[model samples]
Target: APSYRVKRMDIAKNDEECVVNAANPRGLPGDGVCKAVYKKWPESFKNSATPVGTAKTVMCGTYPVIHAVGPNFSNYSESEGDRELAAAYREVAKEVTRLGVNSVAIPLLSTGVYSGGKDRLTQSLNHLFTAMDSTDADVVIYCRDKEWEKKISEAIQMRT
Candidate 1:
């Protein structure tokens, strides 16, 4: 099984080999966490944004940022968005395996203001955990706040 941990930290400052960006399909770093990423690596985001369900890797300081575009919660069914979230996580896992990445930091995708709320948060975390379980990289999940930390802890506990 892949090694993963949950923590309340800044994903932007994370020192892992890879940092996953919760990006839009256009690859533009507009809102939410993407803004910080763009600020840190503007040219990288400008060059690497890909289609939804796909991802692009660009150098961010010393590590590579895995920019994956997840489904917009307002634009799709809960189930459809969940699947897209899973695909995005899987893409990260794939990159970790292919590139021999030792560690990666990921934020909860599709769980922000655009999301449908707590239900989407739970589903998104579940999908991410499920996909990451098949990889070998050391994974760190950056929770947005204490509430998210609690929910993610519960979700992982349920899986255990």
Candidate 2:
């Protein structure tokens, strides 16, 4: 079964075996979660284009950083956003498979400055929860506060 847990802590401060960064295609630790990721490990972003709906993994100072490029709604329509966002999480799951890690902590990608669609947070986690079913790793979603935590928990439960 797929396992998911919501963490009320910061994604950048995450000490899990693996951490997911909401990264841009040009992985520079530009803004949002990537900045915090860079702060923790300056070399996490190695000057590369991760491409939308895909990810690149880096050996961050501590835990490995799976930099996932999310969909920017500036170019994608609502339907496109949905697909791309989900695809991105799927790529994260794929990376988890490649790493064979025990635990992972992820943030709500494309839900902040890059996204223009609604319900993207829950939608992102929904795809993530479903995609993680193939692995035995415990997945963790970290957000700003309890409101986000509640939504994430609800999202995790809805998965069949």
The lDDT of each candidate is: 0.78, 0.80
Question: How high is the lDDT of residue 106 in model 1?
Answer: 89
**Where does the lowest 10-residue lDDT sum fall in candidate 2?**
117-126
Error of 2 at 4 (Å): 1.3
Off by over 4 Å in 2: 157-160
Which candidate has the top score in lDDT? 2
List, residue by residue over 4-73, the lDDT tens digit for candidate 2: 7888876877767999888888777576677787888777677546899888888865568898888988
lDDT of 1 by residue, 26-136 (tens): 777687688888887776775785876777788756567888878877888878777788888888778777778878898888778557554576777777878788888
Candidate 1 C-alpha error for residue 121, in Å? 2.2
